[PDB]
Design a protein around this ligand. Structure first.
Ligand code: FAD
Ligand code: FAD
Ligand code: 31T
Ligand code: 31T
Ligand code: K
Lengths: 330, 323
């Protein structure tokens, strides 16, 4: 059974791991290859800070909440193990800030110690009058990919640099199953106008005294500050439809000004890095089987917008179940 | 008017600075010490604001300190001071009453069952948001501020108060930490020896303090700016200045048990120091040439320094009123 995973970002690699894990014993052989034209550190996943928090707008979709829940419990079970530094996985607490009161989120019990902010905490943020405090976790995108890559390498998964032009190209080389985890660029392989880039820009600064995340909300251009292992991510940029890869100077100014107003100690933080990425925005994730005419199936797993880390593991297990249902059939 | 402060730890320097700011409106101030940063006990402290669990005016000096620091935590100077917000955990075997300082800190609450599931050894505790004021940095900062203001510093081991009086000191501010007894007998002053190590573990974003009602030989993990402090050693009466293998093993085993991610972390260093333990901070006046005592702040020198600095400044003001 020759499987080809197209995509080496969090979705591609986690899906690959779940397939190997569930079906390596069952197939003789399970042969798994990953193709991609961008590998860490050049993927969209590498840009992500990796804070576990779904978006504010609840889609009222319990399958998706359950994928998110699953990912969180999965991560939590790793967080106090020897592995965890290697995943780039740790616990972090912090603030969500609003101008107006709004209802409690549906994930309020998934995270730890969720509560409303007190008056004296709100006094620390003069521009905001309502908010949340909780403890969640960060899974730093670059590190996780590195960790996933090692696990895949130990298991005999091979990696190839390739820009795939079509599914047929891969099918004609003998792939029995193609796993399509091509993120925001999925449209090049099969027309899909619901998939758009949600362009983002961030900067990484040296500010190791910042121990909390801070997220603000006005639709998604509002500053956030999210400490990682080594650096602090500053951002708050979201431009639907914009395909520019360049760091933009207005946006730079917008992140820096906005974040400094929020946390003036940042004024003296040294800027280490700056990056631009494209969130794979789709009103919902594409995750399904689709047969081609060649015998060759595709499993789509793409379109996770601004929450790919938050939800990836549930999606990976689902994709593996689809893979399993292909085995039952064929 | 001539003042000599003895001691260059947090207590001496903060007292010096707080007196100068409030009274220079014509002070000659000198600091004498035989140890300056990074070699004082203050340099060993992680700098977490938390008073002891045991429960007079000291609670206000602590609260004054927190409020003072909280109001500068976004200042331009905060990075130089070594000052930042930090949240974390206090872990206990059984229920205990909320501390007197619970509304001083930010967002005090009990731990929820799911939080407690992360720590198999403990069934109860707290979460709250406090602050860190890193001793190394804070001392560098105060030294710099004091130096702008004319305060002159001298490497000197003072042999007595009279020695200093005879050099024309009008007021001696005695901020000699655990060694105050070598200048005036004090049977109530003992060393509370502590040992720590510092590791490179910058994914640790929370403090974790445990309690065993031992006394205070219980593991604690306290992230700093650059490094993370591992500790949990309190030995009353022990005067050994050196690090010790038994204690290193207690710190390391106890903390890795508490946080197994620490197995990965590189040890940067390892220090020993002496908390100035006393039933009570000695903060008061005596005549020999006038002396103001400010010593015996145990394991809460950083936590309490500013209120003590203010009280010593009031004491300094009353001496002026009398001259
Ligand atoms: C600034 C910013 C911050 C973010 N922060 C967070 C966060 O805190 N938490 C969170 O959950 N999410 C966050 N995200 C979202 C997260 O980045 C994405 O949802 C996630 O990375 C999507 O992963 P993916 O594997 O689908 O895509 P990618 O990581 O982009 O991987 C796509 C892969 O497909 C390959 N590929 C594509 N087309 C082809 C082809 N034709 N041939 C071969 N290879 C191909 C690419 O080379 C790449 O390997 C953030 C995004 C941005 C932009
Ligand atoms: C391991 C450890 C961890 C700690 N963690 C914390 C914490 O997180 N938070 C907290 O609030 N507290 C903490 N403490 C306690 C805190 O460090 C002390 O309360 C504080 O440092 C006392 O400061 P000091 O200036 O009184 O003494 P020191 O810092 O010891 O300074 C004493 C000064 O007196 C000088 N001196 C003494 N005698 C003479 C003489 N005859 N002539 C000249 N100079 C003299 C010395 O050179 C020195 O400069 C900790 C202590 C230890 C040991
Ligand atoms: O509804 C929201 C909106 C944001 C947000 C706000 C401003 C700018 C961009 C995203 C948002 C940001 C974060 C921080 C991490 C993050 C940041 C991103 O830019 C992103 O696309 N995903 N995740 C979050 O965990 C939840 C979020 O939920
Ligand atoms: O009653 C206590 C006891 C401790 C404690 C625990 C173990 C070893 C030493 C002190 C303790 C420790 C800390 C952590 C910071 C600290 C750590 C010390 O070793 C110390 O001596 N003072 N302060 C605290 O904020 C409050 C504390 O209150
Ligand atoms: K427990």
């Amino acid at each position: 059974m020759r499987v080809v995973v197209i995509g080496a970002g969090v979705i591609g690699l986690s899906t690959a791991l779940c397939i190997h894990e569930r079906y390596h014993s069952v197939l003789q052989p399970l042969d798994i290859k990953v193709y991609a034209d961008r590998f860490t550190p050049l993927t969209t996943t590498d840009v992500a800070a990796g804070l576990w928090q779904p978006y504010l707008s609840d889609p009222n979709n319990p399958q998706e909440a359950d994928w998110s829940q699953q990912t969180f419990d999965y991560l939590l079970s790793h967080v106090h193990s020897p592995n965890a530094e290697n995943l780039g996985l740790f616990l972090i607490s912090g603030y969500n800030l609003f101008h107006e009161a709004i209802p409690d989120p549906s994930w309020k019990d998934t995270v730890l110690g969720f509560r409303k902010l007190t008056p004296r905490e709100l006094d620390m943020f003069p521009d905001y009058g309502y908010g949340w405090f909780h403890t969640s976790l960060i899974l730093e995108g670059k590190n996780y990919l590195q960790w996933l890559t090692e696990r895949l390498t130990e298991r005999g998964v091979k990696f190839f640099q390739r820009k795939v032009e079509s599914f047929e190209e891969v099918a004609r080389e003998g792939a029995d199953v193609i796993v399509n985890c091509t993120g925001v660029w999925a449209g090049a392989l099969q027309r899909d106008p619901l998939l758009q880039p949600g362009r983002g820009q961030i900067m990484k600064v040296d500010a190791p005294w910042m121990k909390h995340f801070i997220l603000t909300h006005d639709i998604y251009n509002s500053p956030y500050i999210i400490p990682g292992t080594q650096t602090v991510t500053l951002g708050g940029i979201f431009q639907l439809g914009n395909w520019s890869e360049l760091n933009n100077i207005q946006d730079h100014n917008t992140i820096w000004e906005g974040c400094c107003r929020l946390e003036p100690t940042l004024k003296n933080a040294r800027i280490i890095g700056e990056r631009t990425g494209f969130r794979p925005v789709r009103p919902q994730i594409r995750l399904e089987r689709e047969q081609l005419r060649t015998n060759t199936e595709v499993i789509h797993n793409y379109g996770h917008g601004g929450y790919g880390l938050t939800i990836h593991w549930g999606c990976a297990l689902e994709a593996a179940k689809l893979f399993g249902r292909i085995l039952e059939e064929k």
